[PDB]
Amino acid sequence: KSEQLLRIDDHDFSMRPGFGGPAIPVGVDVQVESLDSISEVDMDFTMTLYLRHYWKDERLSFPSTNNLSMTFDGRLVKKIWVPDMFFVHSKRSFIHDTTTDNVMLRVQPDGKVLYSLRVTVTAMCNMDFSRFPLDTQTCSLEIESYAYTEDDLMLYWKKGNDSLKTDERISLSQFLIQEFHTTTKLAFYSSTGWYNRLYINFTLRRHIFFFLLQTYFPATLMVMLSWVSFWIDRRAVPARVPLGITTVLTMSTIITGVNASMPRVSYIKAVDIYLWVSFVFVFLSVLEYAAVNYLTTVQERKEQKDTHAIDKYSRIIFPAAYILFNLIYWSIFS
Amino acid sequence: KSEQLLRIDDHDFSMRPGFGGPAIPVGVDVQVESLDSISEVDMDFTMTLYLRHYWKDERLSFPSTNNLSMTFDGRLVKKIWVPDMFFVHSKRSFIHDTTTDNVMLRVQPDGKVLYSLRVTVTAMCNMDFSRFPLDTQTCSLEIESYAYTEDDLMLYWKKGNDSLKTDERISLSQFLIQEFHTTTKLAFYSSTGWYNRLYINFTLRRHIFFFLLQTYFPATLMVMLSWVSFWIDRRAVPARVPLGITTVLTMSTIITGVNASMPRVSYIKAVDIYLWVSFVFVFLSVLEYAAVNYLTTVQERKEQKDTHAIDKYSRIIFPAAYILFNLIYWSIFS
Amino acid sequence: KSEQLLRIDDHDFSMRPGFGGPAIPVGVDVQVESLDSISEVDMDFTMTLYLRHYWKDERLSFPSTNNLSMTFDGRLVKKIWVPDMFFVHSKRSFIHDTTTDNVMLRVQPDGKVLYSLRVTVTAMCNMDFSRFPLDTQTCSLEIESYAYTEDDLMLYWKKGNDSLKTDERISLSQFLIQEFHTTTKLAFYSSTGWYNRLYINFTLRRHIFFFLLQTYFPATLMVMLSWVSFWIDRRAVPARVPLGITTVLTMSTIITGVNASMPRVSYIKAVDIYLWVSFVFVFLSVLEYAAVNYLTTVQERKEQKDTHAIDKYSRIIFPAAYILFNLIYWSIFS
Amino acid sequence: KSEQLLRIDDHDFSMRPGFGGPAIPVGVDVQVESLDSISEVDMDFTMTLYLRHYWKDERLSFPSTNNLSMTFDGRLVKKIWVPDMFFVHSKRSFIHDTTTDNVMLRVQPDGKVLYSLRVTVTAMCNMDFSRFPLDTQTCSLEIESYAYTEDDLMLYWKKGNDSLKTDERISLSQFLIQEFHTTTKLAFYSSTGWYNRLYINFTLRRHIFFFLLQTYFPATLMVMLSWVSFWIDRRAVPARVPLGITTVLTMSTIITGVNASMPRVSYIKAVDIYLWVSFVFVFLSVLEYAAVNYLTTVQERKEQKDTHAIDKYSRIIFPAAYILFNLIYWSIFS
Amino acid sequence: KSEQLLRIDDHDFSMRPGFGGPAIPVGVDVQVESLDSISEVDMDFTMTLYLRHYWKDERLSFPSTNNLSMTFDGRLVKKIWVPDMFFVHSKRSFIHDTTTDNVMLRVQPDGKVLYSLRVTVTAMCNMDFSRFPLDTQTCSLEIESYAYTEDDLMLYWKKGNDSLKTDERISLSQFLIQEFHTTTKLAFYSSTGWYNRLYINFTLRRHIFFFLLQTYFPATLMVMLSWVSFWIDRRAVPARVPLGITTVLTMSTIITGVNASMPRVSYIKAVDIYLWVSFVFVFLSVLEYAAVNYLTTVQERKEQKDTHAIDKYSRIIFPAAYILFNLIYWSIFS
Ligand SMILES: *[C@@H]1O[C@H](CO)[C@@H](O)[C@H](O)[C@H]1NC(C)=O
Ligand SMILES: *[C@@H]1O[C@H](CO)[C@@H](O)[C@H](O)[C@H]1NC(C)=O
Ligand SMILES: *[C@@H]1O[C@H](CO)[C@@H](O)[C@H](O)[C@H]1NC(C)=O
Ligand SMILES: *[C@@H]1O[C@H](CO)[C@@H](O)[C@H](O)[C@H]1NC(C)=O
Ligand SMILES: *[C@@H]1O[C@H](CO)[C@@H](O)[C@H](O)[C@H]1NC(C)=O
Ligand SMILES: CCCCCCCC
Ligand SMILES: CCCCCCCC
Ligand SMILES: CCCCCCCC
Ligand SMILES: CCCCCCCC
Ligand SMILES: CCCCCCCC
Ligand SMILES: CCCCCCCC
Ligand SMILES: CCCCCCCC
Ligand SMILES: CCCCCCCC
Ligand SMILES: CCCCCCCC
Ligand SMILES: CCCCCCCC
Ligand SMILES: CCCCCCCC
Ligand SMILES: CCCCCCCC
Ligand SMILES: CCCCCCCC
Ligand SMILES: CCCCCCCC
Ligand SMILES: CCCCCCCC
Ligand SMILES: CCCCCCCC
Ligand SMILES: CCCCCCCC
Ligand SMILES: CCCCCCCC
Ligand SMILES: CCCCCCCC
Ligand SMILES: CCCCCCCC
Ligand SMILES: NCc1cc(=O)[nH]o1
Ligand SMILES: NCc1cc(=O)[nH]o1
Ligand SMILES: NCc1cc(=O)[nH]o1
Ligand SMILES: NCc1cc(=O)[nH]o1
Ligand SMILES: NCc1cc(=O)[nH]o1
Ligand SMILES: CCCCCC
Ligand SMILES: CCCCCC
Ligand SMILES: CCCCCC
Ligand SMILES: CCCCCC
Ligand SMILES: CCCCCC
């Protein structure tokens, strides 16, 4: 019997190998299969990957005439001792079990053990949307032992930076993924001790042109369209008056639609400043003609008892101010 | 064997230590890892944390030549006696189990036991939105024993206020978190007895300027824009008439969008009063010109058979009334 | 050992106490902790509560020198016999298990047993929205034994109406809860027999003023605003014409927003009648001026080859009809 | 002991009764408790019901002096042999387990067995929305044995059509349920053999008047309102021009709202044809006046160098065409 | 006993048949039952199917006088050795278990075994929406062994292309399914070795006419309606001015509604180009009349101190440019 060549009943597998002595080293390899989703409101991402472990245990040695290793499944895991890695700062995770548990075990004749499993994990990631939609985000995934400190278990990447592999077809619907690399660091708990921690890092970016076309183009078009009133005859009140209020209504509807399209992040972003500055420009364009009309009526009544200079100066002042605002805005936000 | 140094089979672990005598004291430490989400419609929040227990049991003592403690996992938990803390007023909760159960056990040679586990819990919190968006909310998390009254188990914070730790990077997308502290209180059940309860408290706040810019600015702009009609010549009926109805339409669309953006809380809030008062002002601005036009037509027909005084008085009355309303409103709602 | 004082191995716990004889009485107490949510589309509600059982079993008696009772947990439940209550007309439910099963057992020396557990349940409730938003709903929760008929198990409230307790801070975001009381009734199954059933009843109400302000106010304002056209000079066609169509557009947008705000209940409610009657009034106000203008043009052309009487009669007829409709509507719907 | 009167250890319950001989007949009864929900996008429905089984097994006979039957629970199910019915074409299902498994067993002294359980199941149903909202749907639920063909197990309704019962208060929020009946049929699998299958059928209908009032009324009102322009003086260009474009805008907003209100079924339905035909009529009403105005201007310029006939003919042609379209449409779609 | 004819206790079922020798061949058959849903944001699909396995094991042979095979359930699976197939690139999956596990076993007297189970699986699929709504997508489902390489287990389709069957009533609400076929390929893992993989492929298509009618028709209608202004008298400023701004508002609302209706794919698609080109045309139509009016006013003022040529040329230039754009667009996008 396979479980009789291995002396399962003769050893206490509730304790780590080398109990009471130096720490046992464990090597780790990771292969990333896919990135499933990302949430901007809850600030988390989902990943599916393969996790592998490497260690040696003399209690699992068996006599053999050659180097043929045996293979087992998740049923033997509950009997032998195995590491207890967990994902730090994770929200939820599970191990796939169809059509059975995705667990394998390979034992060398001298006692070397390979332990692999397939897992999906959701982890948190703090994001800053102040520079939206020109922002860039960085995320990380962390692995650590739960029960054993550095004095009992030593955790490291088995092959350095070569221990990380990624699928050729990994992609996201609305982000660009790049710059995968791994690092290590020591963690401290005030009541427990010191622990080793591993990291996997990557970066995300957006598509700029889509957001530009969807947001900045209509606002600029409406602002430029509001300047048309400066060239219409001032005597045509029933034509000059409705144009401004209709432009205001159009801008308000555009802003409402843009707000409805974006995720519910409740603080000021870069796009809001541009939109509301455009709204203020459209607002001032309406008061200009009211002032002009009042002055014309007062002059006519006084006379009773040619282009106005305000239009002539507005035709020059408004585009220059808009260009200056655009220059400052695009110099600040790169 | 580790489970033979501990006399597992020689003791009845179905009863608490010191059964039939004084209550056994248990100490508790908590470390908060993250706040996951918050719901304003269901009135609850989600938290992930570490929970630790401290107690002594002579039945778990083992002989040793030094102070080296043993370490175990969740498999030994089902055999020995452990406390039964639960979260009061919680909706749902679970213990993480990837890649295995996040449970540890450390036993001192003299019988002192440390028991720790990692858990995510969702708890209810009553909220009042009468002062939205200038409201402030307070939340609490409660811990209590389920089966043992104060005559059998005594629960306390092990190190007073030093028993609570929070992560350095805890944050929320739309709230500001502050003022973490712990308290204690006694609870009474009419059919069961008295129990000790522990509390963890914190406060939440919003970003005022975002809501101000998104809501109060356009309404004030539209109200000020409606006053322009008071300065246009009364003889230009086809210019005076459409302006009011278009302003009414714009205000209605703005109110509809604002209502669609907010969560579905079905009672009156502070913002609604401001919005509907602005709507009423815009409404009255339309009836003013109708009265003026009717009076002018009646006068002209009588004569057949200069600014009107109503406009002159409106130009002064409307802004003063709006300023008085703003002063009263901002004095009441701080 | 505790499980040896109780003769667990000497008795067949697969059969109820007093098997083959009279029915065994069981008492029930309930404490309501919170109401979690309510769905108007799926017609269900969620509740969390404590459930307690009382019965006597001589097979669990143990010798003792005093009245000290023993305490156990969910592990002993799988060995002894326990009642099998279930929730009738429920959709889903579960028992909390963090950090362990929320189950307790207390056994008196003479054999009296107390059995308590904590559970969350979702139950259906038929609702009628014909009188929305002035409707009132009544809901109930039902408890019954699954396997044992009244000839084998007798179920009753232990202390009558005093067996129901409710939390002091139970509340809902959009409803008012009142009138908790309990009743009993007998149930019949054609293929199984008769069963006892228990009931918990309560009532729900809404906030009227919020819905009034959000719906009835703008429609009335628009209807009153449409009457302004009756006082404008009939010769100002470019002013009379756009007002009606703009009012129609505003009313249509308001109705669309109100429909989008309400839940998807696909049959006629009270508010829809009011909204569409207002729409019909606004519609007729437009045809009135078309008739007036056609008559004026015909008269002028005939003459070629002062207020119109229609306006004079409309100024009186329209408000009277609207007031009559309001009186009838508010007399029918209380 | 109850489990010793039944010779559990003396029989191999891994094989069906009468193994190697004729098929064993099994009777089935069903009682429907409620219909929980229905999805028009995923095309499925949810149901909760009671399922009962009837068969005889001599291996479960016990000696008794009378006809008193014994009662058991789900614990005995794992030892004795039971049928293996499953729901064909189902997406997900589960058995209720609060406060324990909803399973009962009753065994007669001669070996007759009754087996009942409570289950919730979600099943698919193909739907056709071409005639929306005047469509009618039919759904079915299927029961079949998984492992045993007709040569080993014979499945039938125990009492014919009397085996189906429905709750008195079953209802849906947006559908009308009627015509419950049962049928039987034989199923064939190319690689396994023949199987018996049972069916439960019902029909669903909608509320016509709600959809009529919400959709067809405003479109007809707008189409009739667009005809007003035919009676206004052609010389009033600033009154004739805006009316058409404002009607077009109103119709577009109504269509957008109606599309937003309906579920996301991505193919043409009956309502879309009506809406777009109305839109085309409103579109043509605008080109009519443009042609009239161009002809009038050309005539005036020629003369420089009374109602137009087009209006006179349009006043007759447009309503007749609309009535003909309505007659054809309502004759085709019943 | 059935489990005593099979020598369960006499064999070590932790190792594959023929351990230490040549690979054991396993045959696979699949029957597709239904396609449940498809997500365009998460890029995945859900499928329900039957999975069957074929292999021979001499350790399960039993003596029999005829060719009668025995039948078992999921309880025997935990004792005998079974293959360990899993779904590659899957997100989540489960095995149905109502009213019991959907697992069957049939063993021939000579040791041939049939193993079948029912499973639902969700798998990822990369999609490209650049040609929306004229895009075409291809999807695949993959099956592979987890623990055994090609040197230990050989996987193949049992009957070639005849091993795949599909239900007669499989359909989707918004897609057309076609072209089911199977393929095979070898997979390599750098740290584990080589594996055999199986594929199931199919194609999806959309309904073109629905999207055409919903999107392209109103934009073309609005563009054609904007050309009407070229035929109105230039002296009617209060009629020429509002038409353009109202058309702009209508186009903006249509674009906002279309964007709200589509799924949140954040990059440029084919429809957006058409919509924004139409918007630009409508925008230029407004500047044309502003230029014409300014020139007319300048000429009149100069004279103080007939159709304009711009209109005559625009009437020809605008439709020709629109037709050229349509030809190029529909030649590029087929
Ligand atoms: C791994 O490679 C990355 C590439 O950016 C580098 O930053 C990092 O320092 C490397 N780490 C090690 C341990 O070599
Ligand atoms: C803990 O500190 C908080 C800080 O606000 C204080 O309110 C509270 O009383 C302290 N509790 C104890 C037990 O010292
Ligand atoms: C309990 O009190 C309620 C209060 O409304 C009453 O209606 C009911 O009849 C009472 N029931 C009993 C059993 O006393
Ligand atoms: C059951 O009754 C229904 C009622 O419509 C009928 O159609 C059906 O044929 C009946 N079936 C049997 C088996 O009697
Ligand atoms: C199966 O049939 C498909 C039909 O398209 C074909 O492409 C494929 O090559 C065939 N495969 C085999 C193994 O015959
Ligand atoms: C791809 C379109 C880019 C448009 C940019 C507009 C910036 C104002
Ligand atoms: C944080 C600065 C915001 C400024 C917004 C100005 C809008 C007119
Ligand atoms: C609100 C517009 C008033 C314009 C007055 C201008 C006085 C110079
Ligand atoms: C913002 C333009 C102001 C122009 C003022 C001109 C005064 C003669
Ligand atoms: C950061 C913008 C604040 C705007 C406040 C407006 C109050 C009416
Ligand atoms: C609770 C007072 C609400 C007052 C609203 C007034 C709206 C005009
Ligand atoms: C509805 C407006 C009527 C105005 C009448 C004014 C009489 C002084
Ligand atoms: C609200 C302004 C009223 C002004 C009335 C003036 C009467 C001469
Ligand atoms: C609290 C505001 C009530 C408004 C009622 C309006 C009824 C037409
Ligand atoms: C059930 C009667 C509905 C009447 C609606 C009338 C809308 C004009
Ligand atoms: C559609 C309006 C027609 C008005 C005709 C009135 C004839 C008295
Ligand atoms: C609904 C008002 C009708 C008025 C008719 C007056 C006829 C002289
Ligand atoms: C209950 C209102 C029915 C309205 C039908 C309108 C059909 C055009
Ligand atoms: C399937 C025929 C659709 C016709 C739609 C016509 C819209 C003007
Ligand atoms: C686009 C409208 C043109 C009208 C021309 C009519 C020529 C008879
Ligand atoms: C659709 C109405 C056309 C009317 C044409 C009349 C030509 C004299
Ligand atoms: C079935 C209606 C097709 C409409 C196509 C319109 C293309 C501009
Ligand atoms: C990728 C080319 C997009 C061009 C869009 C032009 C919109 C006017
Ligand atoms: C913004 C429109 C200006 C038009 C000027 C035309 C000069 C030839
Ligand atoms: C896009 C049309 C331009 C027409 C220019 C005509 C100059 C005489
Ligand atoms: N390193 C994991 C861990 C367990 C614990 O109690 N504190 O940290
Ligand atoms: N203290 C927890 C608890 C259990 C119970 O039955 N009542 O309260
Ligand atoms: N009283 C519960 C029950 C079980 C059953 O089969 N019918 O009703
Ligand atoms: N009748 C159920 C079933 C099982 C199987 O493998 N094929 O169909
Ligand atoms: N072939 C499945 C698998 C397991 C593993 O560790 N790598 O790939
Ligand atoms: C906003 C422009 C006002 C001009 C006053 C001279
Ligand atoms: C609402 C203003 C009315 C003025 C009447 C004199
Ligand atoms: C709807 C009012 C019409 C009046 C006809 C005299
Ligand atoms: C659409 C109506 C056009 C009329 C041309 C004579
Ligand atoms: C956009 C058209 C402008 C014409 C200038 C001559």
What does the alpha-carbon distance between residue A256 and residue A245 come to, in Å, rounded to a whole number? 16
| Among C106, C105, C104, C110, CA closest to C67 | C110
* Among E77, E90, E234, E269, the residue to mutate for chain A (most A Cβ within 10 A): E90
Give the distance, in angstroms, between the CA of residue C105 and the centroid of all CA atoms in the same chain. 35
Which alpha helices (DSSP H) does chain D contain, by range? 2-5, 74-77, 208-211, 217-226, 237-261, 270-304, 309-332
Beta strands in D96-159 (DSSP E): 103-107, 112-124, 137-145, 153-157
Contacts of C151 (CB under 8 A, 6+ apart): C23, C193
Q: Per the CB < 8 Å rule, is C104 touching B276?
A: no
Q: What angle in degrees, to the nearest 10, is found between the helix axes of D217-226 and C270-304? A: 10
Question: Is it true that the peptide bond before B99 is cis, omega within 30 degrees of 0?
Answer: yes
| Among B282, B281, B279, B306, CA closest to B295 | B306
- Report which DSSP code applies to B201: E
Q: Are E318 and E259 in contact (CB under 8 A)?
A: no
Question: Is it true that the peptide bond before D238 is cis, omega within 30 degrees of 0?
Answer: no
For B21, phi then psi, to 5°, come to: -125, -150
Paired tokens of E180: 């089911």
DSSP letters spanning E36-92: EEEETTTTEEEEEEEEEEEEE-GGG----SSSPPEEE-HHHHTTS----EEEETEEE
What does the alpha-carbon distance between residue E250 and residue E256 come to, in Å, rounded to a whole number? 10
Burial class (CB in 10 A: 0-12, 13-18, 19+), C22: exposed
Q: Tell how far the Cα of E249 is from the centroid of ligand 24, in angstroms.
A: 22
Q: Are A155 and A198 in contact (CB under 8 A)?
A: yes
What does the alpha-carbon distance between residue B4 and residue B54 come to, in Å, rounded to a whole number? 23
Q: Per the CB < 8 Å rule, is B96 touching A119?
A: no
Q: Tell how far the Cα of D260 is from the centroid of ligand 34, in angstroms.
A: 34
The residue type at C177:
I
| Among C85, C232, C87, CA closest to C155 | C85
- Cβ of A224 less than 6 Å from ligand 31: no
What does the alpha-carbon distance between residue C238 and residue C289 come to, in Å, rounded to a whole number? 12
Q: Per the CB < 8 Å rule, is D119 touching E98?
A: yes
What does the alpha-carbon distance between residue E107 and residue E113 come to, in Å, rounded to a whole number? 5
Residue A288's Cβ-side half-sphere holds a number of Cα atoms within 13 Å equal to: 26
Task: Tell me which residue has tokens 């139509």.
Answer: E285
CA angle D228, D233, D238 (to 5 degrees): 85
Q: Tell how far the Cα of E240 is from the centroid of ligand 22, in angstroms.
A: 30
The experimental resolution of this structure, in angstroms, equals 2.6
Paired tokens of C193: 């027999």
3-state SS class at D165:
strand
Cβ atoms < 10 Å from Cβ of C323: 10
Q: Are C13 and D3 in contact (CB under 8 A)?
A: no
Rg (C-alpha) for chain E, rounded Å, is: 34
* Count, residues in chain A: 334
Buried b (16+ CB within 10 A) or exposed e, B33-70: bbbbbbebeebbbbbbbbbbbebbbeebbbeeeeeebb
Paired tokens of C199: 């009931």
- Report which DSSP code applies to D150: T
Cβ atoms < 10 Å from Cβ of A69: 16
Q: Are E192 and E221 in contact (CB under 8 A)?
A: no
Contacts of C6 (CB under 8 A, 6+ apart): C60, C62, C107
What does the alpha-carbon distance between residue A329 and residue A220 come to, in Å, rounded to a whole number? 14
Q: Are C74 and C103 in contact (CB under 8 A)?
A: yes
Determine if residue E116 is labeled as part of a ligand binding site.
Answer: yes
Give the number of the atom of ligand 30 that is nearest the alpha carbon of residue E88: 2
Q: Are E139 and E204 in contact (CB under 8 A)?
A: yes
Chain A residue at shortest CA distance from B1: A12
* Count, residues in chain E: 334
Q: Are E33 and D89 in contact (CB under 8 A)?
A: yes
The residue type at C121:
V
* Pocket lined around ligand 6, Cβ cut-off 6 Å: A 209, 212-213, 216-217, 220
For B32, phi then psi, to 5°, come to: -90, 130
What part of C 203-232 touches B (C-beta under 8 Å)? 206-207, 209-211, 213-214, 217-218, 221, 225, 228, 231-232
Question: Is it true that the peptide bond before A98 is cis, omega within 30 degrees of 0?
Answer: no
CA distances from B244 to B248, B290, B292, D157 (A): 6, 11, 14, 73
| Among D83, D76, D64, D59, CA closest to D6 | D59
What does the alpha-carbon distance between residue E139 and residue B47 come to, in Å, rounded to a whole number? 39
Paired tokens of D126: 């193909």
Q: Tell how far the Cα of C17 is from the centroid of ligand 33, in angstroms.
A: 85
Ligand 13 mutation pick, B317, B318, B322, B324, max ligand atoms within 8 A of CB: B317
Q: Are C243 and C228 in contact (CB under 8 A)?
A: yes
Q: Are C191 and C213 in contact (CB under 8 A)?
A: no
CA distances from D60 to D78, D81, E109, E172, E302 (A): 14, 10, 29, 49, 116
Strand partners, D184: D198
What does the alpha-carbon distance between residue B6 and residue B62 come to, in Å, rounded to a whole number? 6
For D314, phi then psi, to 5°, come to: -65, -40
Q: Per the CB < 8 Å rule, is C221 touching B283?
A: yes
Cβ atoms < 10 Å from Cβ of C228: 21
Cβ atoms < 10 Å from Cβ of D11: 18
Q: Per the CB < 8 Å rule, is B1 touching A12?
A: yes
Residue with CA nearest ligand 28 atom 1: C146
Handedness of CA A297, A300, A306, A309 (dihedral sign): negative
Cβ atoms < 10 Å from Cβ of C65: 6
| Among B198, B231, B197, CA closest to B312 | B231
Domain ranges of chain A: 5-207, 208-334
The residue type at C116:
S
Cβ atoms < 10 Å from Cβ of E109: 17
Which chains share 3+ C-beta pairs under 8 angstroms with D? Answer: C, E
- Cβ of C284 less than 6 Å from ligand 15: no
- Cβ of B309 less than 6 Å from ligand 13: yes
What does the alpha-carbon distance between residue D45 and residue B69 come to, in Å, rounded to a whole number? 58
Question: Is it true that the peptide bond before A133 is cis, omega within 30 degrees of 0?
Answer: yes
Q: Are C289 and C229 in contact (CB under 8 A)?
A: yes
3-state SS class at A262:
coil
- Chain B residues touching residue A276 (CB < 8 angstroms): 213, 217
Between the two ends of chain E, the Cα-to-Cα distance in Å is 70
Q: Tell how far the Cα of D294 is from the centroid of ligand 20, in angstroms.
A: 6
CA dihedral E234, E237, E240, E242 (to 10 degrees): 170
CA dihedral E67, E68, E74, E76 (to 10 degrees): -70
Which of B3, B171, B253 is closest, CB to CB, to A14? B3
- Chain E residues touching residue D248 (CB < 8 angstroms): 225, 250
DSSP letters spanning A17-32: TTTTSSPEEEEEEEEE
CA distances from C103 to B145, B152, C57, C106, E138 (A): 12, 17, 19, 10, 52
- Report which DSSP code applies to B215: I
Paired tokens of B61: 């003592």
| Among B266, A26, D233, CA closest to C235 | D233
- Chain A residues touching residue E301 (CB < 8 angstroms): 306
Q: Per the CB < 8 Å rule, is A249 touching B254?
A: no
Q: What is the 3-state secondary structure (H, E, C) of C187-256?
A: EEECCCEEEEEEEEEEEEECCHHHHHHHHHHHHHHHHHHHHHHHHCCCCCHHHHHHHHHHHHHHHHHHHH
What part of C 127-166 touches D (C-beta under 8 Å)? 146-148, 152
What does the alpha-carbon distance between residue D76 and residue E136 come to, in Å, rounded to a whole number? 55
What does the alpha-carbon distance between residue E326 and residue E320 come to, in Å, rounded to a whole number? 10
What does the alpha-carbon distance between residue A144 and residue A88 come to, in Å, rounded to a whole number? 7
What does the alpha-carbon distance between residue D296 and residue D303 come to, in Å, rounded to a whole number? 11
The residue type at B313:
Y
CA angle D241, D245, D247 (to 5 degrees): 115
- Chain D residues touching residue E118 (CB < 8 angstroms): 86, 146
The residue type at A87:
F
Determine if residue E144 is labeled as part of a ligand binding site.
Answer: yes
What does the alpha-carbon distance between residue B43 and residue D2 come to, in Å, rounded to a whole number? 51
Ligand 9 mutation pick, A287, A310, A315, max ligand atoms within 8 A of CB: A310
Paired tokens of B69: 């403690």
Residue E226's Cβ-side half-sphere holds a number of Cα atoms within 13 Å equal to: 30
Q: Per the CB < 8 Å rule, is D276 touching E217?
A: yes
- Chain E residues touching residue A243 (CB < 8 angstroms): 241-242, 245
Paired tokens of D134: 């005047």
* Strand order across the beta sheet in which E176-189 lies: E85-88, E137-145, E193-205, E176-189
3-state helix vs strand vs coil in chain E, percent to 5: 35, 30, 30
Paired tokens of B248: 């009414």
3-state helix vs strand vs coil in chain B, percent to 5: 35, 30, 30
Experimental approach:
cryo-EM
Binding site feature residues of D for 4-aminobutanoate: 52, 116, 144
Which of E52, E73, E250 is closest, CB to CB, to D147? E73
Chain B residue at shortest CA distance from A12: B1
Cβ atoms < 10 Å from Cβ of E188: 8
Chain A residue at shortest CA distance from E288: A228
3-state SS class at E297:
helix
Burial class (CB in 10 A: 0-12, 13-18, 19+), D6: buried
Contacts of A97 (CB under 8 A, 6+ apart): none
Cβ atoms < 10 Å from Cβ of E25: 13
| Among D149, D177, D198, CA closest to D51 | D198
* Count, residues in chain B: 334
What part of C 78-107 touches B (C-beta under 8 Å)? 96, 98-100, 102, 104
DSSP letters spanning B9-63: TTS-TTS-TTTTSSPEEEEEEEEEEEEEEEETTTTEEEEEEEEEEEEE-GGG---
For A286, phi then psi, to 5°, come to: -80, -40
- Report which DSSP code applies to E215: I
Q: Per the CB < 8 Å rule, is E120 touching D237?
A: no
CA distances from B58 to B3, B8, B24 (A): 15, 12, 12
Q: Per the CB < 8 Å rule, is E124 touching A36?
A: yes
Chain A residue at shortest CA distance from E240: A239
For E217, phi then psi, to 5°, come to: -65, -55
Cβ atoms < 10 Å from Cβ of B220: 14
For B151, phi then psi, to 5°, come to: -75, -10
What is the longest distance spanned by two Cα atoms in chain D? 124
Task: Tell me which residue has tokens 């995968």.
Answer: A180
Q: Per the CB < 8 Å rule, is D99 touching C94?
A: no
Buried b (16+ CB within 10 A) or exposed e, C289-316: bbebbeebbeeeeeeeeeebebbeebee
Handedness of CA D126, D129, D132, D135 (dihedral sign): negative
3-state helix vs strand vs coil in chain C, percent to 5: 35, 30, 30
3-state SS class at A74:
helix
Handedness of CA E12, E16, E20, E24 (dihedral sign): positive
Q: Per the CB < 8 Å rule, is E117 touching A96?
A: no
Q: Are B2 and B69 in contact (CB under 8 A)?
A: no
Q: Tell how far the Cα of A298 is from the centroid of ligand 8, in angstroms.
A: 11
Which chains share 3+ C-beta pairs under 8 angstroms with A? Answer: B, E
Q: Are B236 and A237 in contact (CB under 8 A)?
A: yes
Which of B43, B147, B249 is closest, CB to CB, to C73? B147
Give the distance, in angstroms, between the CA of residue B207 and the centroid of all CA atoms in the same chain. 14
Task: Tell me which residue has tokens 């129901």.
Answer: C164
- Cβ of B287 less than 6 Å from ligand 32: yes
D331 Cα to chain E: minimum distance (Å): 24
* Strand order across the beta sheet in which A85-88 lies: A85-88, A137-145, A193-205, A176-189
Q: Tell how far the Cα of B287 is from the centroid of ligand 32, in angstroms.
A: 7
Binding site feature residues of B: 52, 116, 144
Residue B44's Cβ-side half-sphere holds a number of Cα atoms within 13 Å equal to: 18
DSSP letters spanning E128-156: --TTTTS--EEEEEEEEESS--TTTEEEE
Task: Count chain B–chain C contacts defined by CB atoms under 8 A.
Answer: 142
Ligand nearest to the CA of D157: 4
The torsion region of residue A14 among left (phi > 0), alpha (psi -120 to 50) and beta comes to alpha
